[PDB]
């Protein structure tokens, strides 16, 4: 009669590492590292992401002709640019505080586009047509931004213009506009008609006075002239007043914004699909409850802490010794 004390074993081939010894076969163990994604960009809370396509934030918000599919967009879970998002600012020039504007869009869940200054009723004393360019061509013909209006002189006359807008939308109104800088003094007259023009813009927290920087520059997209893009969030109840004697790319359409955390902008070439997830990465979605993942640093939703590790297996059972 005997009795022996011993321990468990099995066919498990799971190896873990310790500080003293590597590749130690154990009987049980949990994996802490998620490394399997979806390969697909999915919805979040049932709401689909916004594909920009061959367009970037600038193009979309400005109304670049190549970005007409996006005119419909009103709500999104997150915004997605790609490797080919190059259609942004078709007329050469600076987009002042562009990176900052993007940072703002990051906390926007949706907006309500609207005509802030109706093109066919806001400018009785100025040329509302003729404001097109080969740089912004559409369908083979010269065109322009869909959300902006390039004003010009009405038969050799450009009377000072004043035009205000009061915010009654009960939210922030994103107002964009531009100031044109001709190459020569000749073009300045042909366009505006006043050689010494100016553009002034004022709200409760915004006050700035732009003046034409006439100069000769290398042609970019066939333009020696430049166009500088500006913006501002108009607060609920606040007025914004435009004054100009020329060079004004007036706002046509605006955006009444809706805030919402948990949003953001990613760059991905992965395809969008009709699926739902609580975690999104540039490579794909993640359906897991593991503490870690080595897929991607960039994340949207509730995700596991990103880590460089290749393997994070922690032991739960004992050292495995079948000794058959």
């Amino acid at each position: 009669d005997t009795i022996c004390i011993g321990y468990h074993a099995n066919n498990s081939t799971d190896t873990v590492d310790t500080v003293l010894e590597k590749n130690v076969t154990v009987t049980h163990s949990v994996n802490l590292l998620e490394d399997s994604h979806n390969g697909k960009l999915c919805k979040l809370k049932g709401i689909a992401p916004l594909q920009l396509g061959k367009c970037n934030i600038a193009g979309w918000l400005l109304g670049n002709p190549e970005c007409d599919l996006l005119l419909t967009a009103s709500s999104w879970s997150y915004i997605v640019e790609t490797s080919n998002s190059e259609n942004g600012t078709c007329y050469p020039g600076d987009f002042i505080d562009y990176e900052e504007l993007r940072e703002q869009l990051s906390s926007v869940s949706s907006f309500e586009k609207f005509e802030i200054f109706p093109k066919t009723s806001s400018w009785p004393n100025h040329e509302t047509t003729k404001g097109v360019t080969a740089a912004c061509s559409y369908a083979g013909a010269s065109s322009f931004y869909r959300n902006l209006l390039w004003l010009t002189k009405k038969g050799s006359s450009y009377p000072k213009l004043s035009k205000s807008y009061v915010n009654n939308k009960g939210k922030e109104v994103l107002v964009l506009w531009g100031v044109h800088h001709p190459p020569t003094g000749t073009d300045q007259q042909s366009l505006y008609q006043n050689a010494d023009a100016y553009v002034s813009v004022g709200s409760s927290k915004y006050n700035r006075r732009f003046t034409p920087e006439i100069a000769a520059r290398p042609k970019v997209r066939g333009q020696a002239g430049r166009m500088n893009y500006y913006w501002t969030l108009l607060e609920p109840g606040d007025t914004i007043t435009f004054e100009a004697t020329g060079n004004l790319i007036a706002p046509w359409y605006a955006f009444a914004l809706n805030r919402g955390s948990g949003s953001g902008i990613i760059t991905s070439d992965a395809p969008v699909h009709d699926c739902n997830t609580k975690c999104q990465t540039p490579h794909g979605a993640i359906n897991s409850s593991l503490p870690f993942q080595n897929i991607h640093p960039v994340t949207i939703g509730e995700c596991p802490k990103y880590v460089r590790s290749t393997k994070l297996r922690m032991a739960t059972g004992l050292r495995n010794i079948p000794a058959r």
Partner: protein
């Protein structure tokens, strides 16, 4: 092993027993068989389960984390931002790996200890009524049946003995 039980004075484990982590063999006049200790495998499971959950709670998950853009005259701010991201990534990667390595060491030694502690709970229950062979095996002096065996793996021996 740290406690010299597993892979020690008990050279191997038993692929047989499949109802627990630690246990007994017992070869009687009525037959053989395996039997796992409810007492000790339960405590071990409650413990390991708890160690894992503790580690997970500490590692708070990761909400929306996107990148920022910088223009060409913001290269210092861009590199600062980059130094922060790579910085925290270095640290969390190091913590995560380092923690596992350490707790795995703690975990294997935890088992080793448990096997050891069980063997010596039995040894201090039998004393004269059995001798230590080698591979953590006790040879009876007083012939113990199936009803008697279940008193040992119970923590309730009785010690009525003789020769020897």
């Amino acid at each position: 092993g740290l406690f010299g039980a597993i892979a020690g004075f008990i050279e191997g484990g038993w692929t047989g027993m499949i109802d627990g982590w630690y246990g007994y063999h017992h070869q009687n006049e009525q037959g053989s068989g395996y039997a796992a200790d409810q007492k000790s495998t339960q405590n071990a499971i409650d413990g390991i389960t708890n160690k894992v959950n503790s580690v997970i709670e500490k590692m708070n998950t990761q909400f929306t984390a996107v990148g920022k853009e910088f223009n060409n005259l913001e290269r210092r701010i861009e590199n600062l931002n980059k130094k922060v991201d790579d910085g925290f990534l270095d640290i969390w990667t190091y913590n995560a790996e380092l923690l596992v390595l350490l707790e795995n060491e703690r975990t294997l030694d935890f088992h080793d200890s448990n096997v050891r502690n069980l063997y010596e709970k039995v040894k201090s229950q039998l004393k004269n009524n059995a001798k230590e062979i080698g591979n953590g095996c006790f040879e009876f002096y007083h012939k113990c049946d199936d009803a008697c065996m279940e008193s040992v793996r119970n923590g309730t021996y009785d010690y009525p003995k003789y020769s020897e």
